[model samples]
Target: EQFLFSSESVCSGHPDKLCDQISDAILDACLEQDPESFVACETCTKTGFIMVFGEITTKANVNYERVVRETVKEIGYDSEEKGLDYKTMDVIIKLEQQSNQIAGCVHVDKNVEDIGAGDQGMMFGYATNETKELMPLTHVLATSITRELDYIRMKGVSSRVGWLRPDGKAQVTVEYNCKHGVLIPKRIHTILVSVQHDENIENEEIREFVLENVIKKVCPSDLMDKETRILINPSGRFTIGGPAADAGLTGRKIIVDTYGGWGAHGGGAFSGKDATKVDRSGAYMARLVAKSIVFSGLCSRCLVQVSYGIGIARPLSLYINTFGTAKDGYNDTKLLEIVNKVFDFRPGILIKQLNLKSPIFKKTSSGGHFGRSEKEFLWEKPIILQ
Candidate 1:
């Protein structure tokens, strides 16, 4: 039977995404100053109020206001002339020292490698052959759509697209068919886009421009038929968006941060959490294993789940599923054994192996976190399997 699958992506200016950026920016500052900093910063903003709060234990002296303001401005929220303004927002920092109880569990014990999981949570990692990135085709296009919008928004007032603002979303629906018993993409069913813009622009023009520049430009021509639906801000208005229009909180866009609903998720958010937090690292380590399995040609797709108990270094369980695509005689169980042989799931081993204790969180806070094969987000680096 044929199927329709969809995935969504938000721009860096998305309120929740903006908060993620702010949290990560602060996290980056902390890491830059103190690599061992333990931070779980959360940010929220609405109207003229910007609230930054969370538990942070760091030797780094970072200005939360500056970090928040700079992050907002960089995301195209420099002036209140549009939806939100960074300069005028009342920045309130409510950060408290991290709990010593939790710290006691994760702090260096016999060695730096003696740390344990910071929190109990499950995370899933997935990889597919749907696109060159080994990610779902819908997400690949979804991410590209918003990034194109961001590229235009960042052009500044000197450019004609200055009417473009931050805080936008894009989505793609793909038609899939099980070909020869394998789920494969047939074509894209729909392309949806909603971006914050100046009220001054005519609604027709707003729709027309993006349909051409973002929608038509990003989707692969082969996957789009004349019947393919194209929707750009179907609501007809987006003059108000970002934090000013609504409050935003970190870790709120967990689905968008990972597989975009195309794959199973273990229900953990990534932003603002320290590496020691299983919510952040467990998923990361699992992704390395999953991607490595697919990359090593053991399977065409893989979804890996690893669970951890707080205050424990070793994972409670490790599981893998390749659906019906397992190859090289590496069934799920065989791949599980291979995975254990090739990767280390212990929290400390995961941290040290990934070289995760650094100012790398900022780079990962955007771009859907998972598909980015860039070197800085080491978890995205696929492993070499035996």
Candidate 2:
């Protein structure tokens, strides 16, 4: 029997991603001023205020409240009456300075030198040819829908659907069958969407409205077969949402940020840490590796694993799993050799390779970060290693 693979993506206003944007924004500012800054910041937001707690070693004076508010406002949480408005929300930031010894040597040159990862953790990256971008199609399509919804909401058009809230979710389930050792998508089995709306919106009315307006606009009609289950607002209504309805913390939505649940995660969250940390930089390196493998025609699907220890510049391990998709002549050993020759797995090299110290993260906080193509997003770019 064939199997089913499904993945979900969330919108920017989702509580967890809101916290993530704030954290990444702060990290970006700190890195702008001091590229060698060591940071491990975490953010939490609720109904009334945002709290930031973390340790850092840098000369930069970061505007914590501005970062939080700007991130929130950009994510469409700017309503004063909503109890979580970016302007009205109080922000408390607590910072502790770590010694230079603890933070390791600061890189005076633009190029990093002997910088070690901040903490010990594992990170994974995955890719499959089921999609043109080497990503799982179900998750990719789901993210595209949510991203389009966000784009439409930000445009603030005069359309009736302009009332759509920033926080929403898109889920896609795809039926997959192995055809001669290849994972081929058979059909789209289901699509589930839950969008938050204003309090005055009626549940039944909103359901019909979304089905006709948003769902039909994004998903192809043929993909929605008669048997395909379409669940809109499975819980009925989503009036009370954002940070007001639930608390949010940075790094909580790691799976959503990556390849949904289709790929394995190293368990390290990307939001709060700067690129020096393997949690963020190393993961990008792994992604580059995975993309390279799929692009090199070595495999139809690939997963790259890189592990690190605190204060270590080198990855403890570089492991690859192709799931039997490698070309007839290429074995695991040959693939690993090709990967080692093509990519630099060291911490400092990885950071520079990905240009990890940029403010591009806020865009990634909402959509699945791996497959999309943004000029500044390094992970999404494929390295040609032919």
Candidate 3:
């Protein structure tokens, strides 16, 4: 039997992603000066205002306003006509101290099992042999499309595609052939993109530009046939976009940030929080575990889960699901045993192993956090395990 699976990604300039970037930028800024900083910042943007509000306990002297401005400016939101002006937008800062009760739970122990989780929650990490990155094909392709969109947009006048605006989204639908529980991506069923563009360019030009540079360039030739559906700006005009046309908040694109709907989500958002939050660090560890299992050839597909209690240093539970793709003589139970031996789920260990306290989070804020080849994404590097 065959079926279609889909996933979507937004450009770095997308309003929700814009908010994510701002939050992580603040987190990174704090970490640069004080790696021990506790930041759970959140952000919101709309119209002409951007608000930063959250619980931040840090000794570092971080100018939240300056960080916000630099992040916004880097995202190409510099002029009023671009939906946000980094120089002029109102920067509302509403930061406070972490709750005493919560802080008490998290800051207790110095042992290996020390540093309780910032909160109680479940987090999931998934991987598959469907792509070289061990990520779902649809997710990787979708993210690639949006990334190319931003890349060309960033090239500015040199790209000769200057009419592109900041806000944009991409979705990829891949037809997979399934046999005996094994899945193979057969072809790209559809590639849909909606980009914010200047009013000067006609729909014809926008369509041509996207088809040639974004869709055709990023997608493989063999995977796209004449029947492949390419929908560019299907809703017609997109002259008004970004924060001006819509409101955006941090952690809104959780699916885009993780496995892109392929695996179950624990409903915890990753942006604006330090690694002590299992929602962020635990998820990264799970990814390392899952990708390592798949990369080690113990399984062709894997999903790793860990649950934590507020202020508890160790995870309450750890689970593994290979989706019946485990190699001969290896069951999910045995895989879990191997994972336990190979990985540590403590909040502090996750931070230490992955170097989560560094100012590297700002890059993970956009463009799908997992499956990236970047050196900063330490968790994506699979650990060797027998």
Candidate 4:
């Protein structure tokens, strides 16, 4: 049987991504001033106002307004003509300390091994051999196009791709062959791009320019054939974009941030939460375990889920499914046995082992977190099992 899988990714200036970045930027600021900070931040944005609000328990003294402005500016929302003006945008701060009832057990001062989970929930991580990044083909390609657009725009859209506004999205669909219990990606089925641009540009030029510069440059040529359908700004014009046209909030792009609808999600958003929260650390560790399973040649694809309860240092359960792709005689049960001896499923251990206390999360806010190549994304790097 043949099937199609689709995934979508948004640019840095996309409203939801903007809020995510702002939230993570605040977390980073707090962590920079104090590594032991506890931050669960949230951000919301509208036309001329960006609000930063959440629970934070930290010794760190950070200027919320400064962080918000800087984050927005870095996202290329500095000019009003681009839908947002960071310099003039009102910054609203509505933050409070974490509740004593919840923070008591997960406090940073507690012994490294004794730190409990921040809240109760499950986290999932996934990996597949369809791409070198151990991610689904549809997801990786979708994110790649958006990432490239952001990069090119940041390098100076005036000098490069002209009139490319900050907000945009890319969606990809890949045809896959389900052969005798094995899945293989055949080729790209469709590519769609909706980008915010200046009003002066016509639909014809937008289509040609994006087809040549973005799609052709980022998408794999071998996977694209004459049959592949490419759509660029099908609605025609997009002069009003960003927060000016749409409201955004943190954690709204959870699917985009993770596997891009490939495997499973526990429904806990990663941004704004510190390592003490199992939502962030546990999910990262799950990805590490899943990717390592595939990297270790034990499986071609893997999904790992770990759950925890608030105020508990140890995880409630750990589950793994290899989708019958485990190598040779090994099965999910056998792989689980091996994983138990290799990875520690405790929240405290995950935070310490992965060095999750650092402020490297802001970068993860935009790109798909599970398939990145940055040095800051330690969990994406697989652990070797002996």
Cα lDDT, all candidates: 0.83, 0.79, 0.91, 0.89
Q: Write the per-residue lDDT of candidate 1 for residues 105-187, one digit (tens) a residue.
A: 87646356667789777778889877777787888889889878887777543547867888899999999987643568888
What are the runs in model 3 whose C-alpha is more than 4 Å off?
109-113
Off by over 4 Å in 2: 80-83, 99-101, 105-111
Best-matching candidate per TM-score: 3
lDDT of 3 by residue, 22-80 (tens): 99999999999999889999999999989999999999998899999999999899888
Off by over 4 Å in 4: 108-110, 157-162
lDDT of 4 by residue, 1-386 (tens): 78998999999999999999998998899899899888989999999999988899899988889989988988889888798999999999999988888877775468878788899999999998888999998988999999988988887655546688999999999999975445698999999999999978788988988898888998889999999999899878898999999999999999999988988999988888899888889899999999999988888899999999988888899899998888888898988888899888787788878888898999899988888999878898898763
| Model 4: pairs clashing at backbone N, Cα or C within 3 Å | none
Q: Please report, as a residue range, the 10-residue window in candidate 3 with the lowest summed lDDT.
A: 154-163
Positional deviation of residue 283's Cα in model 1 after best superposition, in angstroms: 1.0
TM-score of 2: 0.93
Worst 10 residues of 4 by lDDT: 154-163
What TM-score, computed on C-alpha atoms, does each candidate reach?
0.96, 0.93, 0.98, 0.97
In candidate 1, stretches whose alpha carbon ends up further than 4 angstroms from where it belongs are 155-159
Model 2, range 55-108, lDDT digits (tens) per residue? 877778887788778888877787844437887888999888765564653343
Give the better candidate number (1 or 2) by lDDT. 1
Ranking by TM-score: 3, 4, 1, 2
What would you estimate as the lDDT of candidate 3? Answer: 0.91
